[PDB]
């Protein structure tokens, strides 16, 4: 029941780059129904993104190696590659389910709501990267519904230069380019947030400037590649 010891366990697991232990500690912290602090919010997000990130990187390598040897005519090998991709997919979907179930029932102050709603859209987007058929259509809807609800709260109570609001528009614009295959609508979300924030660049304290301008640079980097 020692909450602070579990948080310090997550800090240790991060320094040791053992993100499986870090995720389990923060999930245990979240399950105490106590509101997560700002640092504890990042600890949870960093842990689970690294856990799901290793599967996303492995899935891309296997999917690239599977679709490249499709004309090789080796079914004994092609089936083994396809079976591996499904194994990585099952791990990825299970990791996404753990976060989404934790957000809706424990997690999902307006800054926390936008942070958790962006995570919901992010992990539904990670599911949409591997899902197909009717399963792919329903995760896109749950990702769009989570991003849009976070966009509405961010536009009302958050200034355009807020790092959370800027980062939300980055992933929201990435969602429309890589999932929905809509380059124009993706450019609109990245250009509107960049323009709204750069118009008020003379508003940032001596600690958020490094963070706010970093995401603004990432928004323009995506806008350049999409034009």
């Amino acid at each position: 029941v020692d909450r602070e010891q579990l948080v310090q366990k997550a800090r240790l697991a991060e320094q040791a780059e053992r993100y499986d232990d870090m995720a389990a500690a923060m999930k245990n912290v979240t399950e105490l129904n106590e509101p997560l602090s700002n640092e504890e919010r990042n600890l949870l997000s960093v842990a689970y993104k690294n856990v799901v990130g290793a599967r996303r990187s492995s899935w891309r390598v296997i999917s690239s190696i599977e679709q490249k040897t499709s004309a090789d005519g080796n079914e004994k090998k092609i089936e083994m590659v396809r079976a591996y991709r499904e194994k990585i997919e099952k791990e990825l979907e299970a990791v996404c389910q753990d976060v989404l179930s934790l957000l809706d029932n424990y997690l999902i102050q307006y800054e926390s709501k936008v942070f958790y709603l962006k995570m919901k859209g992010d992990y539904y987007r990670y599911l949409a990267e591997v899902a197909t058929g009717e399963k792919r259509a329903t995760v896109v809807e749950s990702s769009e519904k989570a991003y849009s609800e976070a966009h509405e709260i961010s536009k009302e109570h958050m200034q355009p230069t807020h790092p959370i609001r800027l980062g939300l528009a980055l992933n929201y614009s990435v969602f429309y380019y890589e999932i929905q295959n809509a380059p124009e609508q993706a450019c609109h979300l990245a250009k509107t947030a960049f323009d709204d924030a750069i118009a008020e660049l003379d508003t940032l304290n001596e600690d958020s400037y490094k963070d706010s301008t970093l995401i603004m640079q990432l928004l323009r980097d995506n806008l350049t590649l999409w034009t």
Binding site: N42, S45, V46, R56, R60, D122, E129, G167, L170, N171, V174, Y177, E178, I215, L218, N222, L225
Partner: peptide
């Protein structure tokens, strides 16, 4: 990928 927020 690699276009989303790195944190």
């Amino acid at each position: 990928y690699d276009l989303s927020l790195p944190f």
